[PDB]
Swiss-Prot record:
Stretches buried in the membrane, not crossing it: 253-283, 333-366
Cytoplasmic side, ranges: 70-80, 169-177, 248-252, 284-292
Lineage: Eukaryota, Metazoa, Chordata, Craniata, Vertebrata
Pfam families, per the entry: SDF (PF00375)
Gene name of this polypeptide: SLC1A1
Tissue: Expressed in all tissues tested including liver, muscle, testis, ovary, retinoblastoma cell line, neurons and brain (in which there was dense expression in substantia nigra, red nucleus, hippocampus and in cerebral cortical layers).
First-listed, main subcellular location of the protein, grouped into a coarse class: membrane
Sequence similarity: Belongs to the dicarboxylate/amino acid:cation symporter (DAACS) (TC 2.A.23) family. SLC1A1 subfamily.
Name this polypeptide is given: Excitatory amino acid transporter 3
Positions glycosylated per UniProt: N30
Length: 416
């Protein structure tokens, strides 16, 4: 039995050995900056592999999932998924705002316009490794292209392309076959990378622990951890199971038990995109969910649905505002809530710590962007829990959308 699940136990042992090695090296050894950088080399290699595999997986899976569905019922399923994601994000934002205000632990228009611009890129080839940003200048607007994959535009193009080739009929069957084969090949390559994962996980955790030097910053920011962790726990244990139970009259915790494999995997990597194959297997096999709904809903949720991220950012922005003793009125609460939801619509193909999402909210509330370094220390610990919450929300949404589309799925069975 151990051989079949050998990757999971190996990764758990890697986590244990990483904590031990990091603590022992930090306490009993002295390292310079260059030596600390060279210590985390295998973790850097693992991250490069995952970033490499993101693009083909996302594009091919999106096209295949959209083209599988019939054109009659494609719109309703997408609308239901969008509504669920929007509602969950709003509830998470409200919960985070309420908790951060109660506990008290301590332009933007251009960013929104850039967000809309990135949905319709000028060039498809450039959109695979570059993004678009605008800045003011003495007032004249000037645009520039910066490195970083544009997952928002590629997802929109993939959705439209999949619909077009699924409506065409026999004339576009060769394209469907091409992208199905590409998706299968990408999943197999992801498995091959997951074979090597444990060593990268070991060295990543070891490097994470060693970096902290003072070790009193954790004690100072103890209240800040409690707010974020309590919000994530309440959202994961209370709100999401209750929403699932209201729509689907089943046991919400049996679904989580079936998805436990992908949940713990998502904790390991802390990447929602890289957990797509495990999530597919767990949803289709353990929970007996339909493949047609799953293959289409899950990639969209990975790119779009970010409950833990919205909660995390909102709490951090309010905490930073409280650090500076800046007053926050009723309007300030709303504009932080609204900006947090729409800050980073798509950031799935980017598996590393992004401070730009915080910077948008900071600019909207009118605070300097140099306050990020104060709390940049604990991101390495909080990000894994945030990604786990995101993956859990996606998994719950798959079943919720599947239940609500019984008539559409029955209509799709007579044409098969
Ligand atoms: Na949501
Ligand atoms: Na997600």
């Amino acid at each position: 039995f151990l051989k079949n699940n050998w990757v999971l136990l190996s990764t758990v042992a890697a986590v244990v050995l990483g904590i031990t090695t990091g603590v022992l090296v930090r306490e009993h050894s002295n390292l310079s900056t260059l030596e600390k950088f060279y210590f985390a080399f295998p973790g850097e290699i693992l991250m490069r592999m995952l970033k490499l595999i993101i693009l083909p997986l996302i594009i091919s899976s999106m096209i295949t999932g959209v083209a599988a569905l019939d054109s009659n019922v494609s719109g309703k399923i997408g609308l239901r998924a969008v509504v669920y994601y929007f509602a969950t994000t709003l509830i998470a934002v409200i919960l985070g705002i309420v908790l951060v205000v109660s506990i008290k632990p301590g332009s933007t228009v251009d960013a929104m316009l850039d967000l809309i611009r990135n949905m319709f890129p000028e060039n498809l080839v450039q959109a695979a490794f570059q993004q678009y940003k605008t800045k003011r200048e003495e007032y004249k607007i000037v645009g520039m292209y910066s490195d970083g994959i544009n997952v928002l535009g590629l997802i929109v193009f993939a959705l439209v392309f999949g619909l077009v080739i699924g409506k065409m009929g026999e004339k576009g069957q060769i394209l469907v076959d091409f992208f199905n084969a590409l998706s299968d090949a990408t999943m197999k390559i992801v498995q091959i990378i997951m074979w090597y994962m444990p060593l990268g996980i070991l060295f990543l955790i070891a490097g994470c622990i060693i970096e902290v030097e003072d070790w009193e910053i954790f004690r100072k920011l103890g209240l800040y951890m409690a707010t974020v962790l309590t919000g994530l726990a309440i959202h994961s244990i209370v709100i999401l199971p209750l929403i699932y139970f209201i729509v689907v009259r089943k046991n919400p915790f049996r679904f989580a038990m079936g998805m436990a494999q992908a949940l713990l995997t998502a904790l390991m990597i802390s990447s929602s995109s890289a957990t797509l194959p495990v999530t597919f297997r767990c949803a289709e096999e353990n929970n007996q969910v339909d493949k047609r709904i799953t293959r289409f809903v899950l990639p969209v949720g990975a790119t779009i649905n970010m409950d833990g991220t919205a909660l995390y950012e909102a709490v951090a922005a309010v905490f930073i505002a409280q650090l500076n003793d800046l007053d926050l009125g009723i309007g300030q609460i709303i504009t932080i809530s609204i900006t947090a939801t729409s800050a980073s619509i798509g950031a799935a193909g980017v598996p590393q710590a992004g401070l730009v999402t915080m910077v948008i909210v900071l600019s909207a509330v009118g605070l300097p962007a140099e306050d990020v370094t104060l709390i940049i220390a604990v991101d390495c610990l909080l990000d894994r829990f945030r990604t786990m919450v995101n993956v859990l929300g996606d998994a719950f949404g798959t079943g919720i959308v599947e239940k609500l589309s019984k008539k559409e799925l029955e209509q799709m069975d007579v044409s098969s």
